[PDB]
Structure formats: structure tokens, C-alpha cells
């Protein structure tokens, strides 16, 4: 009837080869509309980075639905359509009230976007009684819940113990349950079942 589901990720992380995981790192061309401080009028690219981009680096974003790994191809859009894209001078509409210029900029973001059901690996910094901690790519902190752990496995004093009886170590394949961006930090919820 009524679709609010028009916000969804139709890109799915494909299971890679040679490997069993999926690539959640992705390049998204985007358009943002930002401000330019008056001091950077001689370094507009340099400014926008310091002014806008750089803070986004390695933080989650709702639009892209991931953590920003970095950016490529920053392009300020000259106000004049007539000017060829080669022109070294571009035009920035100044705010009527204030000296700050506002403009559109095109840039390519590399973003790691874990979805649900994605297959991932990560090292284990701590095996708790409740869970298993995971640094994903030595950055993203992931956790595997107790109930999510198959009950046949055990934890001793300490360290976990699998079905085969050994403790488990280091890189661990797991399936994503949820991704928690509500906290200041991303939290990747994986599951082994």
C-alpha cells in the first residue's frame, strides 16, 4: 500500500573468492552540499577536507549506512554551468547574510558496510564467559552473543571451548546478526549459528 521501504540497501555484499567472506567495503559516489570558511577561499579543496570530510573519516554515517573509510575524487561543482570543467576558477555562491560560501561537491567514499547475514572474520582479543570479542580488520569491534554461540560449546578458566574441545583463537569466521550504530561507536553483532 504505502512504501516507506524506499530507503533500503539494494546492494548486497557478495561472498568473495577465494574466501568465504563478503566485501563490505564499497565505493559510493556521492553529492554533498557544504560550507566553505572565508579563510579557505584560496584553498577550497583543502578547506572542505579539513572543514567537512576529515571529521567523517572513520565514523559511521546513516546515508551510506557504514563507516567512512576515506574519500577520493573530491570535485567542487562550479556554479557556472558554462565554464568548462577544466577552468581553474570556480564560482561559489556566498550566503546572502554571511560570508560563508555554500556549494555542492562530488566525492567518492570508500565505506565498509556490513549487512545482516554477511560473512566476516576477526581476531579474538577476549573470550568471555558471555561472549566472544572481535576486532574486524583490527578496527571494527564485534561481539558474538552467548545464545548465538551454539550451546554445545563451553567456556572454562578463562577461554572458550568449542564442540571439538579446543579453545578457539584469532581470526574467526562468523555471520552478522546486527550492526549497532546507536552508540558513539559501531558495534557489529555476529552469530555462529
Amino acid at each position: 500500500a504505502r512504501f516507506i521501504k524506499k530507503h533500503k540497501k539494494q546492494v548486497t555484499n557478495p561472498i568473495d573468492e577465494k574466501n568465504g567472506t563478503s566485501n563490505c567495503i564499497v565505493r559510493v559516489p556521492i553529492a554533498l552540499y557544504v560550507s566553505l570558511a572565508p579563510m579557505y577561499l584560496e584553498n577550497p579543496l583543502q578547506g572542505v577536507m579539513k572543514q567537512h570530510l576529515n571529521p567523517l573519516v572513520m565514523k559511521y554515517n546513516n546515508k551510506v549506512g557504514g563507516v567512512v573509510l576515506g574519500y577520493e575524487g573530491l570535485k567542487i561543482l562550479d556554479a557556472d554551468p558554462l565554464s568548462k570543467e577544466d577552468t581553474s576558477e570556480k564560482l561559489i555562491k556566498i550566503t546572502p547574510d554571511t560570508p560563508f560560501g555554500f556549494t555542492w561537491c562530488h566525492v567518492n567514499l570508500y565505506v565498509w558496510q556490513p549487512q545482516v547475514g554477511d560473512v566476516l572474520e576477526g581476531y579474538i582479543f577476549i573470550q568471555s564467559a558471555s561472549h566472544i570479542g572481535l576486532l574486524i580488520h583490527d578496527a571494527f569491534n564485534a561481539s558474538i552473543k552467548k545464545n548465538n554461540i551454539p550451546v554445545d560449546w563451553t567456556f572454562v578458566h578463562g577461554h572458550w571451548v568449542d564442540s571439538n574441545g579446543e579453545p578457539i583463537d584469532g581470526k574467526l569466521r562468523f555471520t552478522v546478526r546486527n550492526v549497532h550504530t546507536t552508540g558513539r561507536v559501531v558495534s557489529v553483532d555476529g552469530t555462529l549459528i
Binding site: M39, P81, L82, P99
Partner: protein, 100 residues
């Protein structure tokens, strides 16, 4: 995104229509009494906010005097966009526009 990529393509086309080419630019070569003001004003704000300043200050503590001082040299880096009533506009570099 395609819907956004759409009206971005729509943004250009209309804004292509609304631009008047240099040769096609039909309005007065003079700087209107108003254009002079706001230029001085806008340039003054930026000068006040530590925008780069092309001409020596020589003891001007007043950004607006400074803005005036650049304008004598046409060192002001701005562009006036003159709207015809339809919304199609022109673009005049400051320096190319005859002062008073």
C-alpha cells in the same frame, strides 16, 4: 540514488538554460550603485573573517576601508550574478565591470 542522479541531471539542464554566455551578456557594463555596495559589504565580511587579502593594509583597521581599497585595484575576487526576471541570469566578474 537514481532519483537523486535524476534531478541533478535536471539541475544542470535548467541551470544550463538559465545561464547567459559571455558574448550573450546584454546588461550594463557599469557597476550599479547597489552592486558596488554589496561587493564592498561581502568582501568586507570575508576580510574580517581572515579571508586572504590581496592588497597591503597599510594601517587599515577597518575591513570596509580595506574592501574599498581593493576595489580601487579591482583585486576583489568576486562575481556578480545578475538575475533577469525570468530567472535566467548573467555572470559578471568584478574586474570586468566598470566602476562608477
Amino acid at each position: 540514488p537514481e532519483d537523486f542522479q535524476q534531478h541533478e541531471q535536471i539541475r544542470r539542464k535548467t541551470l544550463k538554460e538559465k545561464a547567459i554566455p559571455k558574448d550573450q551578456r546584454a546588461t550594463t557594463p557599469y557597476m550599479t550603485k547597489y552592486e558596488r555596495a554589496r561587493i564592498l559589504g561581502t568582501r568586507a565580511l570575508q576580510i574580517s573573517m581572515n579571508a586572504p587579502v590581496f592588497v597591503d593594509l597599510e594601517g587599515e583597521t577597518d575591513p570596509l576601508r580595506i574592501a574599498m581599497k581593493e576595489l580601487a585595484e579591482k583585486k576583489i575576487p568576486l562575481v556578480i550574478r545578475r538575475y533577469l526576471p525570468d530567472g535566467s541570469f548573467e555572470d559578471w566578474s568584478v574586474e570586468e565591470l566598470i566602476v562608477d
